[PDB]
Design a protein around this ligand. Structure first.
Ligand SMILES: NC(=O)C1=CN([C@@H]2O[C@H](COP(=O)(O)OP(=O)(O)OC[C@H]3O[C@@H](n4cnc5c(N)ncnc54)[C@H](O)[C@@H]3O)[C@@H](O)[C@H]2O)C=CC1
Ligand SMILES: NC(=O)C1=CN([C@@H]2O[C@H](COP(=O)(O)OP(=O)(O)OC[C@H]3O[C@@H](n4cnc5c(N)ncnc54)[C@H](O)[C@@H]3O)[C@@H](O)[C@H]2O)C=CC1
Ligand code: PRO
Ligand code: PRO
Lengths: 325, 323
């Protein structure tokens, strides 16, 4: 078996590659060449956490992988990231395990790239100002993937944690070579956005629909269970809704389940799944005045296409350590 | 996180340990302190194999583990085991991964132990002769666990491959210190058995119910999908049926699903789940003449308590590699 550490992975993969790869994974999913059973969620109520088991098999790409990822929103208080993951790659021909790789970095990369492909189809091409609510691990790759897809000029970041917003604005500004300024309310970041990035831990809405002007595109990736949401009901109803997967969002995302329980929206309010948009069967952004919202909770195909991408580059680069079991 | 190889694991855990631990896991499951959602099976039709994802959380034992196990019946043609597994242990307090360990040895140990617990409650205490149909990997731990709970004197082994039965008879007899004789039909092994072990890869019945005499207890652990079976409908109908879990067997075991399609039995023919037997809520063996059948497909909690037993012994014994 081969081992790939976070240091190993950061070396191998870039966001432009991951954007292309996640896009192909969804095209493979639309053509009936993907087996993605709904992920299994075990809630650890005793320790305020979740653990998610996300297996998938992409038969054309021959990517047979499972990711074990956990969400503990209070982990940052113990010097630990909220999201920790591991990815296992198996050989489709024998079922033998091929690799164990650190999944935390890949989770952030594949999540940003998933919103990157959706941003290509749903965001105004002339978008230059991006607003970020929640300056955590996901927000960094979220903004990075948005910058790979649009000619972003300036970014606004709001967080309840002043350290996270400052560290984000400083470090990401040199990172992406764009100006990033911390703002001091979620209202301001939402009102001035051409593209809005929401990557929060909050269990109650932070984005009010009354702030969103026309022509803005929203990427929302936060998830803390089916009871939690970061967008109020007005935001969802007001937008042209695209989901990463209907089966996943409708079963896991309080951002959608709660407004439908209220009766503000129904299952038909979902315009399309991302797989239909990538395939060209369903259309993305059609005019300047619509407000587009991409709701993402995570799909296992993004881990498999990224893990096999990273695994095959390690072989070609001689990266990683071999182990016996 | 810590890495544990088969060589690391093989020393650490014994069959007496795993039986005690698996029985405790089933009691924990009965008391509502286990989260064992039904496992996810992805069939790789393209390569004639299955891969199984088995997560579970035992909250009292604080064992949060997932096993990735695969079944490729044609692997023995490539010099590879039919069943290959990996087990990942996570920290319940942080969600952080604690260990990656080889699951092949643990799956054999926990599978034998699960039948070891069932045999203790369902088999006659005066059982002396054990019959084995299918002399593969699982059969060895199956007989070992039966030997840990009953005073077995002699074993009879039948396999469709005479090489496998002979190799089983030789190797297992030295390990367990009991006489083991090769027979040349499933009928003979079944007819003379006090306890019958069935652990085959067959997709069609190998044991006929007409062969089973009264007082026999059967452990059947084979699985090759819900369309495959190693027991004919008569063995199922004739027996008091105990399953490791109702949700798993009725969804995955052709040994049970097919006789229910025929109308020979219905859902009520399941006497009890193993968890109810361990808890004492349901009765085990009530008389000497009953024929008892334990149907096992595998349950994620048995992996979790065994993985955490081993992980916890590795730390105390300084075994494993950090990465
Ligand atoms: N493909 C997907 O959809 C995936 C979903 N997620 C979810 O994305 C979200 C972000 O994940 P991470 O960045 O890794 O965690 P993180 O803990 O490192 O960052 C979360 C940020 O949200 C901020 N925040 C929390 N509540 C806020 C509030 N009311 N108002 C303003 N800011 C607030 C926090 O201060 C923190 O900076 C999480 O909800 C996670 O469950 C995580 C990985 C990928
Ligand atoms: N109940 C549980 O928890 C578990 C279920 N299993 C299943 O147990 C069965 C055996 O597993 P392993 O021993 O690891 O595989 P194995 O390949 O090592 O052994 C299978 C044995 O069955 C024999 N056999 C095959 N067809 C036969 C037939 N018609 N008649 C007589 N003998 C036949 C084969 O010669 C072979 O020796 C498989 O179905 C496996 O999927 C595997 C792990 C645990
Ligand atoms: O799918 C994922 O990877 C993220 C992890 C936390 C919740 N969802
Ligand atoms: O429970 C298990 O581990 C075995 C693996 C193959 C089918 N059942």
């Amino acid at each position: 078996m081969l081992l790939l550490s976070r240091s190993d992975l950061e070396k191998l993969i870039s966001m432009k590659e991951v954007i292309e790869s996640v896009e192909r994974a969804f095209l493979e999913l639309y053509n009936g060449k993907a087996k993605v059973p709904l992920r299994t969620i075990i809630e650890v109520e005793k320790h305020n956490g979740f653990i998610l088991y996300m297996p998938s098999y992409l038969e054309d790409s021959e990517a047979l992988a499972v990711k074990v990822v956990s969400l503990y929103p209070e982990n940052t208080k113990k010097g630990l990231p909220s999201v920790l993951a591991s990815i296992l790659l198996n050989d489709p021909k024998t079922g033998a395990p091929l690799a164990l790789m650190e999944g935390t970095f890949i989770t952030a990369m594949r999540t940003g790239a998933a919103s990157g492909v959706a941003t290509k189809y749903l965001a105004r091409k002339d978008s230059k100002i991006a607003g970020i609510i929640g300056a955590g691990v996901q927000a960094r790759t979220q903004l990075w993937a948005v910058c790979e897809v649009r000619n972003i000029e300036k970014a606004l970041v709001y967080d309840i944690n002043p350290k996270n917003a400052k560290k984000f604005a400083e470090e990401m500004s040199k990172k992406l070579g764009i100006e990033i300024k911390t703002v001091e309310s979620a209202r301001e970041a939402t009102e001035k956005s051409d593209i809005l990035i929401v990557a929060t831990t909050a269990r109650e809405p932070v984005v009010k629909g009354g702030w969103i002007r026309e022509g803005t595109h929203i990427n929302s990736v936060g998830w803390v269970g089916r009871d939690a949401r970061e967008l109020d009901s007005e935001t969802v109803r007001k937008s042209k809704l695209v989901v990463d997967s209907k089966e996943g969002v409708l079963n896991e995302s309080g951002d959608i389940i709660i407004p439908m329980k209220e009766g503000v929206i129904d299952e038909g309010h979902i315009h399309a799944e991302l797989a239909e948009i990538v395939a060209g069967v369903k259309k993305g952004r059609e005019n300047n005045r619509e407000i587009t919202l991409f709701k993402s909770v995570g799909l296992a195909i993004e881990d498999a296409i990224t893990a096999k991408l990273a695994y095959e580059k390690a072989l070609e680069h001689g990266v990683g350590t071999n182990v016996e079991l």
